[PDB]
Amino acid sequence: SGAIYVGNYRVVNRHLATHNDWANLVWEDSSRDLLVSSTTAQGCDTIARCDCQTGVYYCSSRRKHYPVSFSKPSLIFVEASEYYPARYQSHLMLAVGHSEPGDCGGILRCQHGVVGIVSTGGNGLVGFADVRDLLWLDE
Numbered sequence: 001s002g003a004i005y006v007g008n009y010r011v012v013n014r015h016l017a018t019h020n021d022w023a024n025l026v027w028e029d030s031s032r033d034l035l036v037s038s039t040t041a042q043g044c045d046t047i048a049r050c051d052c053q054t055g056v057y058y059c060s061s062r063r064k065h066y067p068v069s070f071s072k073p074s075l076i077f078v079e080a081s082e083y084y085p086a087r088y089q090s091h092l093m094l095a096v097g098h099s100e101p102g103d104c105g106g107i108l109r110c111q112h113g114v115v116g117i118v119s120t121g122g123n124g125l126v127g128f129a130d131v132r133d134l135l136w137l138d139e
């Protein structure tokens with residue numbers, strides 16, 4: 001679990017969005033596993049606007065942060081789950097690191113701010129849904 005709070009927006013994994021997220025929907029994209037909802041309070045986070053390929057992510061299943069080298073956002077095949085059929089997920093970045101079911105929503109950060117959130121994993125890999133291209137989050 002986990003979310004990004006920037007301005008009057010809450011960014012979460014689309015497959016973990018609540019009834020309240022859907023009732024306050026701003027934008028969602030199944031192909032990216034992202035959903036953004038509106039909030040009444042101002043948020044705590046800053047979004048990175050960079051091309052970093054190293055950062056640190058929070059892994060809830062270890063209660064720890066880990067440094068990672070991650071690939072550029074791209075279209076990657078993701079096996080079927082209870083949430084989605086087998087499909088290509090876009091704007092996804094992979095890295096070697098621990099993740100298991102439950103870790104989605106953990107933030108990935110570089111020195112410039114929030115880069116994205118955990119969205120996939122398995123067999124010593126962790127995938128992150130990029131948010132750096134969503135320029136409207138800051139206005």
Ligand SMILES: NC(=O)[C@H]1CCCN(C(=O)Cc2ccccc2CO)C1
Pocket residue numbers: 015033078081083084089099100101102103104119120121122123
């Ligand atoms: N974006 C998606 O389609 C995801 C929807 C939820 C399931 N999913 C995973 O990758 C789960 C997973 C399995 C094994 C280790 C780690 C994880 C990530 O927590 C795919």
Ligand SMILES: [Zn+2]
Pocket residue numbers: 048049050051052110111112113
């Ligand atoms: Zn950066």
